[PDB]
């Protein structure tokens, strides 16, 4: 027969069709403030208690229940049994948070809420209804532009989209501070360093975070003359204006945070070569630190690769941008003259790459 | 520390945030006719060949590539290496279909295309932007009605939505014929039967499919007097008008296809009790066959449960409908007086339940 494969095949097909539902359910849990509700309660919450805290109309309680059932199954909540109140009520299910949902508790350094809201915002999703036309047109543009008629950036700067613009900014600011946790969780990367040059460090926001964890590290914020201006620092902070394609101030290490993903291979190679020279004096002790995405298709964590590819598609459909695979990074690294490198997964699906001369 | 859980937590959180992308990518592959393109080719296709077959503008080729990479990773295509054409070209990747994507080949009894298109249509997705308001309002309605101002049914019958209405109808007709495969893949369920009563069989469409596989089975289409009318049959087909809550014509087996999911427990119990009586004369040899969804949270196939819950949420947000869990079915079955039952997974995530007196 071999056609009896139909079932095993349908299952796989349907699971991918209805996956979107799990995202919408996560979106709902964060917009309803369920995490904060449970967190503020202080202990497992029952349906009714949660419903009361959310101030739901009675008819919306069973809806809350349904979403909860799915979210619980997806690991965003844990079910517990708690006896009712005053004899009559028997036993009730109580919901507790899990590591994933704790990332939804507002007012905390770990809150990824703004990113969940932004990633699943209509401005992120609605454009897909234009996907077929987008594939079949002759104009080269983002899916967002194809569906909207304008670039995402322009759309955001509209006055009628001010709130959306804030939301997006909240997502970035959140993505930026998430880097502090990256430093805290990977001190080993910076421990033996006496100096570090932050390429494209702009006005020093990133270096400031670096100093919040490594205050003795001599950091140099390197960027264009016009961006760094006359900016001054202190004993362990200085600003240098130049062109990274010509040279990079020397230091024990070169940090390239979200810098190379905006450049093609040719331009990225130059930057990496100037980075190797920037650490040459330190010999084999120097290192270059790259912070960008790295997709490893051979990884055994298929789910992670899928997530990385998923994000890659978002970059594609919204900005026509791209993320590199582990292999593309390896080629740049070796073509640049480096000897070895080490990839450390950070922030759920991003990467921290240590490159050695 | 225990806070180092952040990464493991972020991964889980992000995967669920970006899951929707995998659905949109599947949607794109079906709207682009990639399956048919490869199928019609007859053998693994290269990027360019596929691009040529789809008649893509050169700028859209890398986009095709990206979607392909993600879809391949998700198991909808298999990568193969084929040498170029005429020396200069080296080796090129070639894409082959997989069981899942073969379900996308049009013009076949197994084509689930219409369902993919319908499930991921804007009319299915856009309403989610109204989810927060929906949870916080006092009006009891579907999410679709909350976002649109009208019921899905009314929306479909608009003249401006005629094509959408056709699409939806194509999805149902496709879901209906899929039942033929169900019969072919589960002949064992009907083999020892001499007679069968198709409750709510309407005008006999389902019975006709049943006769296409079991032509000697004496089938009785039972429905309301007004729906069955004076309709006549033949040796093995007859129509009987009545009220299933009062009684069901006797037969070796009672078929309840998509009948009980439209009734509450009270009403469903009556139907099941009348079904047990309809087969009483056949003694312990009789059986009742239920075709509806059954969600088993204790199942080891978490993915299947998630898909079932996902679908359940779709029913909820669009029709305010609901699907039963294995336990709810068990209670109805035993409350009805039956002794045992057996669940057989069908059509990716639906169920066929054999109930025994
Ligand atoms: N020739 C050049 N030399 C140095 N910096 C340059 C440059 N051309 C562009 N840039 C810088 O490229 C930077 C890209 S922003 C990269 C992200 C940043 N390191 C962060 O942590 O957020 C900008 O700050 C821009 O001023
Ligand atoms: N009292 C009653 N007795 C018998 N059928 C009834 C009924 N009230 C409603 N129905 C029938 O309920 C059916 C629900 S349709 C269920 C799906 C159908 N068996 C299929 O295979 O597609 C309708 O055909 C309707 O006429
Ligand atoms: O450096 C970053 C950090 C986070 C995000 C970025 C880029 O873009 C993709 C994204 O999916 C996204 C898309 C959005 C949005 C926020 C948002 O956050 C997510 O608001 C509207 O559209
Ligand atoms: O008995 C069935 C069979 C298939 C489907 C049903 C019910 O509803 C949910 C669905 O997700 C769906 C929703 C739709 C659609 C088609 C469609 O198909 C899917 O067209 C517009 O919205």
mmCIF file with all atom_site columns, N, CA, C and O in Angstrom, chain A residues 6 43 62-63 68 75 82-83 93 132 153 173 184 190 224 231 324 344:
data_model
loop_
_atom_site.group_PDB
_atom_site.id
_atom_site.type_symbol
_atom_site.label_atom_id
_atom_site.label_alt_id
_atom_site.label_comp_id
_atom_site.label_asym_id
_atom_site.label_entity_id
_atom_site.label_seq_id
_atom_site.pdbx_PDB_ins_code
_atom_site.Cartn_x
_atom_site.Cartn_y
_atom_site.Cartn_z
_atom_site.occupancy
_atom_site.B_iso_or_equiv
_atom_site.pdbx_formal_charge
_atom_site.auth_seq_id
_atom_site.auth_comp_id
_atom_site.auth_asym_id
_atom_site.auth_atom_id
_atom_site.pdbx_PDB_model_num
ATOM 1  N N  . UNK A 1 6   ? -0.612  8.298  4.591  1.00 0.00 ? 6   UNK A N  1
ATOM 2  C CA . UNK A 1 6   ? -1.515  9.443  4.607  1.00 0.00 ? 6   UNK A CA 1
ATOM 3  C C  . UNK A 1 6   ? -1.744  10.013 5.994  1.00 0.00 ? 6   UNK A C  1
ATOM 4  O O  . UNK A 1 6   ? -1.669  11.224 6.185  1.00 0.00 ? 6   UNK A O  1
ATOM 5  N N  . UNK A 1 43  ? 0.850   32.951 44.773 1.00 0.00 ? 43  UNK A N  1
ATOM 6  C CA . UNK A 1 43  ? 0.727   31.508 44.841 1.00 0.00 ? 43  UNK A CA 1
ATOM 7  C C  . UNK A 1 43  ? -0.247  31.044 43.766 1.00 0.00 ? 43  UNK A C  1
ATOM 8  O O  . UNK A 1 43  ? -0.994  31.851 43.213 1.00 0.00 ? 43  UNK A O  1
ATOM 9  N N  . UNK A 1 62  ? -14.956 30.757 30.459 1.00 0.00 ? 62  UNK A N  1
ATOM 10 C CA . UNK A 1 62  ? -14.678 29.485 29.798 1.00 0.00 ? 62  UNK A CA 1
ATOM 11 C C  . UNK A 1 62  ? -13.633 29.695 28.703 1.00 0.00 ? 62  UNK A C  1
ATOM 12 O O  . UNK A 1 62  ? -12.865 28.789 28.380 1.00 0.00 ? 62  UNK A O  1
ATOM 13 N N  . UNK A 1 63  ? -13.593 30.900 28.147 1.00 0.00 ? 63  UNK A N  1
ATOM 14 C CA . UNK A 1 63  ? -12.609 31.218 27.120 1.00 0.00 ? 63  UNK A CA 1
ATOM 15 C C  . UNK A 1 63  ? -11.239 31.240 27.795 1.00 0.00 ? 63  UNK A C  1
ATOM 16 O O  . UNK A 1 63  ? -10.270 30.686 27.273 1.00 0.00 ? 63  UNK A O  1
ATOM 17 N N  . UNK A 1 68  ? -6.021  28.707 28.779 1.00 0.00 ? 68  UNK A N  1
ATOM 18 C CA . UNK A 1 68  ? -5.207  28.176 29.862 1.00 0.00 ? 68  UNK A CA 1
ATOM 19 C C  . UNK A 1 68  ? -4.852  26.710 29.614 1.00 0.00 ? 68  UNK A C  1
ATOM 20 O O  . UNK A 1 68  ? -3.704  26.303 29.807 1.00 0.00 ? 68  UNK A O  1
ATOM 21 N N  . UNK A 1 75  ? 3.393   24.246 28.252 1.00 0.00 ? 75  UNK A N  1
ATOM 22 C CA . UNK A 1 75  ? 4.372   24.547 29.283 1.00 0.00 ? 75  UNK A CA 1
ATOM 23 C C  . UNK A 1 75  ? 4.495   25.965 29.809 1.00 0.00 ? 75  UNK A C  1
ATOM 24 O O  . UNK A 1 75  ? 5.519   26.312 30.386 1.00 0.00 ? 75  UNK A O  1
ATOM 25 N N  . UNK A 1 82  ? -6.027  22.352 44.374 1.00 0.00 ? 82  UNK A N  1
ATOM 26 C CA . UNK A 1 82  ? -6.208  23.019 45.656 1.00 0.00 ? 82  UNK A CA 1
ATOM 27 C C  . UNK A 1 82  ? -7.667  22.865 46.078 1.00 0.00 ? 82  UNK A C  1
ATOM 28 O O  . UNK A 1 82  ? -8.572  23.059 45.265 1.00 0.00 ? 82  UNK A O  1
ATOM 29 N N  . UNK A 1 83  ? -7.897  22.502 47.339 1.00 0.00 ? 83  UNK A N  1
ATOM 30 C CA . UNK A 1 83  ? -9.262  22.325 47.827 1.00 0.00 ? 83  UNK A CA 1
ATOM 31 C C  . UNK A 1 83  ? -10.052 23.629 47.787 1.00 0.00 ? 83  UNK A C  1
ATOM 32 O O  . UNK A 1 83  ? -9.503  24.707 48.026 1.00 0.00 ? 83  UNK A O  1
ATOM 33 N N  . UNK A 1 93  ? -8.524  23.431 40.180 1.00 0.00 ? 93  UNK A N  1
ATOM 34 C CA . UNK A 1 93  ? -7.226  23.485 39.531 1.00 0.00 ? 93  UNK A CA 1
ATOM 35 C C  . UNK A 1 93  ? -6.660  24.864 39.832 1.00 0.00 ? 93  UNK A C  1
ATOM 36 O O  . UNK A 1 93  ? -7.401  25.842 39.875 1.00 0.00 ? 93  UNK A O  1
ATOM 37 N N  . UNK A 1 132 ? 1.349   35.736 -1.653 1.00 0.00 ? 132 UNK A N  1
ATOM 38 C CA . UNK A 1 132 ? 1.293   35.199 -3.008 1.00 0.00 ? 132 UNK A CA 1
ATOM 39 C C  . UNK A 1 132 ? 1.630   36.274 -4.043 1.00 0.00 ? 132 UNK A C  1
ATOM 40 O O  . UNK A 1 132 ? 2.431   36.054 -4.953 1.00 0.00 ? 132 UNK A O  1
ATOM 41 N N  . UNK A 1 153 ? 9.748   51.066 8.238  1.00 0.00 ? 153 UNK A N  1
ATOM 42 C CA . UNK A 1 153 ? 10.269  52.255 8.901  1.00 0.00 ? 153 UNK A CA 1
ATOM 43 C C  . UNK A 1 153 ? 9.349   53.452 8.684  1.00 0.00 ? 153 UNK A C  1
ATOM 44 O O  . UNK A 1 153 ? 9.002   54.144 9.639  1.00 0.00 ? 153 UNK A O  1
ATOM 45 N N  . UNK A 1 173 ? 14.655  48.523 23.019 1.00 0.00 ? 173 UNK A N  1
ATOM 46 C CA . UNK A 1 173 ? 15.236  48.874 24.313 1.00 0.00 ? 173 UNK A CA 1
ATOM 47 C C  . UNK A 1 173 ? 15.306  47.636 25.191 1.00 0.00 ? 173 UNK A C  1
ATOM 48 O O  . UNK A 1 173 ? 16.251  47.451 25.960 1.00 0.00 ? 173 UNK A O  1
ATOM 49 N N  . UNK A 1 184 ? 26.234  39.066 32.193 1.00 0.00 ? 184 UNK A N  1
ATOM 50 C CA . UNK A 1 184 ? 26.211  38.395 33.492 1.00 0.00 ? 184 UNK A CA 1
ATOM 51 C C  . UNK A 1 184 ? 26.327  36.880 33.372 1.00 0.00 ? 184 UNK A C  1
ATOM 52 O O  . UNK A 1 184 ? 26.977  36.240 34.189 1.00 0.00 ? 184 UNK A O  1
ATOM 53 N N  . UNK A 1 190 ? 34.797  37.913 29.138 1.00 0.00 ? 190 UNK A N  1
ATOM 54 C CA . UNK A 1 190 ? 35.505  39.169 29.386 1.00 0.00 ? 190 UNK A CA 1
ATOM 55 C C  . UNK A 1 190 ? 36.538  39.213 30.519 1.00 0.00 ? 190 UNK A C  1
ATOM 56 O O  . UNK A 1 190 ? 37.326  40.157 30.593 1.00 0.00 ? 190 UNK A O  1
ATOM 57 N N  . UNK A 1 224 ? 32.077  56.320 13.890 1.00 0.00 ? 224 UNK A N  1
ATOM 58 C CA . UNK A 1 224 ? 32.383  57.374 12.943 1.00 0.00 ? 224 UNK A CA 1
ATOM 59 C C  . UNK A 1 224 ? 32.635  58.687 13.654 1.00 0.00 ? 224 UNK A C  1
ATOM 60 O O  . UNK A 1 224 ? 32.093  58.941 14.726 1.00 0.00 ? 224 UNK A O  1
ATOM 61 N N  . UNK A 1 231 ? 32.908  63.763 22.223 1.00 0.00 ? 231 UNK A N  1
ATOM 62 C CA . UNK A 1 231 ? 32.641  62.975 23.426 1.00 0.00 ? 231 UNK A CA 1
ATOM 63 C C  . UNK A 1 231 ? 33.881  62.561 24.203 1.00 0.00 ? 231 UNK A C  1
ATOM 64 O O  . UNK A 1 231 ? 34.840  62.030 23.648 1.00 0.00 ? 231 UNK A O  1
ATOM 65 N N  . UNK A 1 324 ? 23.186  34.867 9.129  1.00 0.00 ? 324 UNK A N  1
ATOM 66 C CA . UNK A 1 324 ? 24.160  33.912 8.640  1.00 0.00 ? 324 UNK A CA 1
ATOM 67 C C  . UNK A 1 324 ? 24.095  32.558 9.325  1.00 0.00 ? 324 UNK A C  1
ATOM 68 O O  . UNK A 1 324 ? 23.673  32.441 10.473 1.00 0.00 ? 324 UNK A O  1
ATOM 69 N N  . UNK A 1 344 ? 28.650  30.502 21.421 1.00 0.00 ? 344 UNK A N  1
ATOM 70 C CA . UNK A 1 344 ? 27.900  30.334 22.650 1.00 0.00 ? 344 UNK A CA 1
ATOM 71 C C  . UNK A 1 344 ? 26.482  30.856 22.455 1.00 0.00 ? 344 UNK A C  1
ATOM 72 O O  . UNK A 1 344 ? 26.272  32.041 22.196 1.00 0.00 ? 344 UNK A O  1
#
